[PDB]
């Protein structure tokens, strides 16, 4: 009622009752900024609840002991925590935050970590350092949320106070239960009330952007800020993902038991798999009916092309013959005292016996309820726990099987009984066939190899420059630059003019750390490498790329698992645990470096690689002879890289969360962020699975069934792997599904294969497929809602976060992750309304002058949030598969344009001047009043702007850019061809675009790419404020040239496309006849069915699509110079500024003058793009067959296009398909009505805009 007194018009404005207007938008936004936490906590007291949300809370959360017994000091003064229950108990305790605290100076009830304890810890006291470690890690756990916490639940109450809505297609009220029913708001309300108590201030903590302020209640524990994020996550999902009460109540019970435990994040780790194991891993186990897709492989088994050959029914034979799950899951529930939850989940799972929509929705509802916090620990725990792992090799390579040394490499013998000879054979032949290619000695290929690894995310030369000072080489420091010294670009410009022998001992330096938190996992510790170490590992990446692209070729996502999950085709999921740590010099890296150093010997015998000269090392490879043998370039790089692989890696660890912790220690783990990590892991996974199936399997079996199975399986036909993991497809034979006992015996034989040479296969076999963390059962896609939380964002550093226009940038990503998942749009997109309205006003704090900021609603619709009612239209009228930007804006205003023009004369805005789009009305007095024009151009304004540019002196700036040009370009044929292309382009083609994509942009581009993370403080933020104020105070007179160019054309929709797939088939979780728009659109157009990573690769015209610069911009520049005139030498020179041999550039320019471009590629002249919401759906057949020109009424003479400038057909394809997809309901065949100007006038206006881009 109290909320209703101020939000009367707005709650009904977004619920489809009245239309959305700028007036209630701005009044509501005034209200959205005007709040207090007491004003939010009147609300949750105000709403009465129906007791189905009520359940007991144990009292052991609020009383938790002191934290002094949990931490101790190592013998090297390392602060590490004491483990009580297993070595995985290394996380944040849940206890006693009120005592190490000092109150704020004007917020007398909120407080902060004490300054005295910080000073005594900077002295070096024991207990002070322990206390500040616990305090800072509690702050870092409490920080991991996007916006402040109450703002989300406020937007929840504003959106969801409207009650149940009216579905326009289904013509009924939805039975999403009201806000008075849900468990998590009740638990949130009661925990906040009991934590406040007698205090007048009611919030448990306050979120400033740097760190949080607490509340001085003696019953406060540190488990509360992740718990409230989980509880508001379950409350925000239940309203809009169509949950039941019961699974939400079970998830809330598990969160309460998580707070009751001795450590919150540790329990969330150890119970991360109760919900999949009882429902998804144990599904149906006896069935009688359903429908499943009948996919069929297209015979070349490297191309990954598919065919949907219809639906097919099910029978009793296709019941789950996977082994049991009862004893292990009951033990897992029994060990932690969660037996009621696992018994309830199993009782409800055993009911279902028919594969249809409701069972898949139940699986999605059970997967959605796992906790969505980010697990966090101090970085010293990460480094001292996960890096101490090391592989055990039960059958090593015997010491007789190696020859003597060649330099510091021994060769594996030919007469070797070990299994490593197949790895040696594979990597030998791969190295020889790599080095025999004439592609590898292309200087453009060398230049793109050097351009590959010097990325902006490059760090840790932080002891390299000290070690290079320790070997007495003179490095320029470039004093006077606004670069930071840590970037890899600055480091490569240091190492530009130095011989390889001087930087040879630069290889054995260390590396610092980079931390990334993950959903329900241990925190990922990414790590860089320095410049000579990433240079010297070039055969190690080239040979693995040749494996993954030419020899074994597993794969460089969804329809693969839709095939592999189809019920006659079982699948085995293969995960390799600790796959970085389990490759060392003991087995792998020894035989890898031996095979590469031996395989590259022939075809590169004397010639050197980039920068690295030839050398000589002596050999003793035959026992009788000893000599010195000349060494080529790539062999020499293997010689230098082998020292580093033998020694192991030291890591320079510095955390900000605990003072006094500073250490290095050696490790043998493979580095995560190298230039050859994922390709190397795929290559080794593929090679070991191959030599498994072809040798080691048949050597250790007696069963003809298992032997007959392993003869038919091969990695070329039945095994797909990415990174470390993958699945293995088992085809269904003639008699049905393959017998599960033989598959079980082969599985327990794969585990014995792994325990020989170091690996530890994590193998799950349950009749489902996991692949790149996407879970598919019976050919049905299931989104993991718990993987994408709405509330939390990953923060690793303790540095303060971004300014205002980025927290509003992230929410379009929130809405799009809602789009990719299956949500009831009736309350989800209305929640997106209330939230994005709530984030719109800011209250800047500039000196003595009061200024306010607000984006209009039309900006939010320009970014991709489709409207509910426009100007007297039907409620719930638009779809969220609309394009973002001008194409979208055009389409949904064109769907309503007559009714919108007729609404213009309601409250009459009448003008004599008759326009072809509007006629009776004027649009200025309407649209500049409603800030549609201002919101259109204000959405067009760039977010997160910054420019430091701290007065670079010209001499040392020029020396930095010249050294960067010298490092990127060594070979002067590249310089000659790019100066030749520049000169010919300024001769012929310059003038029409005045903006070239050139290679000399890249030294400048990397120069400012160093200062893309300078985060200067005040002046450009105030400059952003001034630009937004002047762009608000303006009054435009029209749209842009693109949209006014679009407004001339018209279309017409009818005759309602035939269905692509069956309607009864469950294809995706969360779309069904209950979710009318996305499921109905899915059945209309059909799903993707293509690999869609080779489709976009076929689109781009570049010979390998590798430049280091924006290949979309090169293809756009070539097409824009094609369509406007511009004699062929302009295109030759434009290609030569990217750099070619002057001949293939000329040939490709003469080609691109003439051939017909594909439809999707011609977006580049007009800067369109397919939205990512259309990636799940098919589009290509809709473009080729369901948006066509030359309508059913015949010619209209505003339908003809000349044979010259026929690209307008392909852009009108995008136009009609956007007009199809913006409408709710099915996709509809649309033909081309009048365009009012002709192809002449449309081509002239398009060329007129393409004069100035």
């Amino acid at each position: 009622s109290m909320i209703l007194t101020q939000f009367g018009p707005f709650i009904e404005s977004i619920s489809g009752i009245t239309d959305q207007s700028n007036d209630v938008f701005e009044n509501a936004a005034k209200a959205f900024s005007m709040f207090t936490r007491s004003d939010v906590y009147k609300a949750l007291d105000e709403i009465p609840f129906s007791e189905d949300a009520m359940l007991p809370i144990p009292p052991t959360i609020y009383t938790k002991p002191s934290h002094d017994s949990y931490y101790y000091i190592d013998a090297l003064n390392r602060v590490r925590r004491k483990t009580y229950q297993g070595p995985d108990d290394v996380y944040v305790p849940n206890c006693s935050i009120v005592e190490l605290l000092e109150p704020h100076e004007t917020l007398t009830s909120y407080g902060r970590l004490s300054e005295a304890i910080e000073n005594r810890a900077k002295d070096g006291d024991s207990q002070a350092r322990i206390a500040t470690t616990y305090g800072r890690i509690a702050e870092s756990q409490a920080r991991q949320i996007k916006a402040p916490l109450e703002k989300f639940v406020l937007a929840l109450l504003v959106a969801e106070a409207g009650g149940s809505l009216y579905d326009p297609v289904l013509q009924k009220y939805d039975e999403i239960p009201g806000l008075s029913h849900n468990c998590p708001l009740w638990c949130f309300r009661e925990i906040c009330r009991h934590i406040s108590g007698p205090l007048p201030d009611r919030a448990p903590y306050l979120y400033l952007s740097a760190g949080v302020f607490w509340l001085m209640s003696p019953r406060m524990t540190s488990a509360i800020p992740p718990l409230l994020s989980d509880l508001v996550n379950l409350a925000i999902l239940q309203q809009t993902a169509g949950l039941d009460p019961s699974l939400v109540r079970l998830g809330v019970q598990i969160c309460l038991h998580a707070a009751a435990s001795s450590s919150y994040a540790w329990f969330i780790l150890k119970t991360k798999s109760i919900f999949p194991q009882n429902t998804l891993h144990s599904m149906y186990e006896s069935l009688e009916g359903g429908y499943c897709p009948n996919l069929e492989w297209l015979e070349p088994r490297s191309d990954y092309k598919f065919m949907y050959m219809g639906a097919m029914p099910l029978s009793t034979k296709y019941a789950r013959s996977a082994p049991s799950n009862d004893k292990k899951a009951r033990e897992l529930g029994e060990k932690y005292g969660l037996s009621s939850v696992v018994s309830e989940l199993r009782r409800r799972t055993k009911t279902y016996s028919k594969h249809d929509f409701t069972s898949v929705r139940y699986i999605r509802d059970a997967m959605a309820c796992t906790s969505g916090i980010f697990l966090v620990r101090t970085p010293t725990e990460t480094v001292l726990q996960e890096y101490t792992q090391s592989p055990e090799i039960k059958v090593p390579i015997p010491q007789k099987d190696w020859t003597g040394p060649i330099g510091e490499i021994r060769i594996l013998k030919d007469t070797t009984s070990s299994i490593a000879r197949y790895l040696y054979r594979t990597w030998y032949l791969a190295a020889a066939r790599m080095a025999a290619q004439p592609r590898t000695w292309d200087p453009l290929f060398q230049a793109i190899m050097r351009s590959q690894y010097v990325t902006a995310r490059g760090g840790s030369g932080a002891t390299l420059r000290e070690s290079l000072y320790a070997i007495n080489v003179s490095l320029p420091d470039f004093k006077g630059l606004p670069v930071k010294a840590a970037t890899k670009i600055f480091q490569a410009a240091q190492l530009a003019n130095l011989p390889f022998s001087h930087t040879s001992v630069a290889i054995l330096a260390d590396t610092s750390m980079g931390l990334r938190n993950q959903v329900q996992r241990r925190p990922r510790s990414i790590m860089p490498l320095n410049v000579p170490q990433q240079q010297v590992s070039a055969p190690h990446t080239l040979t693995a790329d040749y494996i993954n692209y030419h020899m074994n070729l597993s794969t460089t996502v969804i329809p693969l698992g839709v095939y592999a999950s189809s019920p006659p085709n079982q699948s085995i999921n293969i995960d390799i645990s600790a796959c970085d740590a389990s490759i060392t010099w003991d087995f792998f890296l020894s035989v890898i470096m031996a095979a590469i150093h031996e395989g590259v010997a022939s075809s590169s015998i004397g010639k050197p690689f980039m920068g690295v000269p030839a050398s000589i090392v002596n050999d003793e490879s035959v026992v009788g002879v000893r000599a010195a043998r000349p060494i080529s370039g790539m062999q020499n790089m293997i010689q230098h890289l082998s020292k580093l692989y033998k020694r192991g890696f030291s890591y320079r660890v510095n955390d900000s969360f605990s003072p006094g912790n500073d250490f290095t220690h050696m490790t043998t783990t493979f580095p995560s962020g190298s230039t050859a990590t994922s390709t190397e892991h795929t290559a080794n996974n593929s090679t070991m699975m191959e030599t498994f199936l072809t040798v080691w399997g048949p050597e250790h079996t007696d069963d003809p069934d298992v032997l007959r199975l392993m003869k038919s399986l091969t990695i070329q036909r039945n095994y797909v792997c990415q990174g470390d993991d993958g699945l293995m497809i088992i085809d269904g034979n003639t008699a049905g599904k393959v017998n599960s006992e033989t598959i079980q015996k082969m599985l327990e034989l794969i585990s014995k294969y792994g325990e020989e040479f170091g690996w530890k296969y994590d193998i799950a076999y349950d009749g489902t497929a996991e692949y790149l963390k996407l879970y598919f059962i019976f050919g049905c896609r299931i989104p993991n809602l718990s993987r994408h939380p709405i509330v939390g964002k990953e923060r690793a550093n303790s540095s303060a976060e971004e300014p205002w226009p980025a927290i509003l940038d992230q929410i379009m990503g929130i809405f799009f992750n809602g789009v990719h998942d299956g949500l009831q749009w009736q309350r989800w997109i209305r929640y997106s309304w209330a939230l994005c309205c709530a984030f719109s006003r800011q209250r800047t704090m500039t000196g003595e002058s009061v200024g306010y900021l607000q984006y209009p609603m039309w900006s939010f619709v320009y970014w991709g949030l489709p409207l509910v009612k426009v100007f007297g239209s039907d409620p719930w009228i638009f779809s969220w598969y609309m394009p973002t930007g001008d194409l979208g804006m055009y389409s949904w205003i064109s769907l309503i344009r007559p009714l919108m023009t007729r609404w213009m004369v309601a409250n009459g805005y009448v003008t004599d001047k008759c326009s072809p789009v509007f006629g009776n009305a004027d649009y200025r007095k309407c649209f500049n009043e409603l800030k549609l024009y201002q919101g259109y151009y204000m959405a067009q304004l760039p977010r997160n702007p910054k420019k430091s540019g701290r007065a670079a002196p010209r001499e040392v700036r020029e020396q930095f850019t010249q050294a960067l040009s010298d490092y990127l370009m060594q070979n002067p044929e590249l310089k000659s061809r790019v100066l030749r292309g520049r000169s010919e382009w300024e001769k012929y083609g310059a003038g029409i675009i005045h903006n070239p994509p050139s290679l000399f942009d890249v030294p400048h581009k990397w120069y400012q790419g160093a200062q893309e993370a300078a985060t200067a403080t005040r002046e450009e933020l105030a400059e952003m404020d001034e630009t937004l104020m002047r762009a608000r105070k303006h009054s435009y007179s029209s749209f842009s040239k693109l949209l006014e160019a679009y407004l001339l054309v018209k279309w017409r929709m009818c005759e309602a496309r035939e269905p692509s797939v069956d309607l009864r088939l469950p294809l995706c979780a969360g779309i069904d006849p209950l979710n009318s728009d996305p499921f109905l659109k899915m059945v209309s157009v059909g799903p993707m069915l293509q690999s869609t990573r080779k489709y976009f690769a076929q689109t781009l015209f570049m010979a390998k699509t590798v430049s280091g610069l924006d290949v979309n911009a090169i293809d756009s520049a070539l097409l824009r110079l094609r369509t406007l005139g511009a004699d062929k030498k302009a295109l030759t020179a434009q290609l030569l500024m990217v750099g070619l041999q002057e001949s293939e550039a000329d040939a490709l320019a003469g080609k691109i003058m003439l051939q017909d471009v594909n439809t999707v590629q011609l977006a580049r002249v007009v800067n369109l793009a397919v939205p990512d919401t259309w990636m799940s759906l098919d589009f290509d057949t809709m473009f080729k067959h369901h948006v066509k020109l030359l309508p059913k009424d015949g010619r209209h003479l505003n339908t003809d296009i000349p044979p010259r400038m026929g690209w307008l057909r392909a852009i009108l394809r995008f136009l009609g398909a956007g007009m199809a997809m913006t409408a709710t309901g099915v996709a509809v065949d649309i033909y081309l009505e009048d365009i009012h100007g002709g192809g002449r006038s449309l081509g002239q206006r398009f060329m007129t805009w393409m004069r100035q881009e």
């Binding site: 489809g16 007729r902 609404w903 004369v905 309601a906």
Partner: peptide, 26 residues
């Protein structure tokens, strides 16, 4: 022929939708 104009009427009794004209309403 076209018939609808700017009207004075709203409130469909089902679906809670108010709109432009009574001729669109009915």
């Amino acid at each position: 022929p076209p018939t609808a104009s700017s009207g004075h009427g709203y409130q469909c009794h089902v679906c809670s939708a108010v709109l432009f004209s009574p001729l669109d309403l009915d």
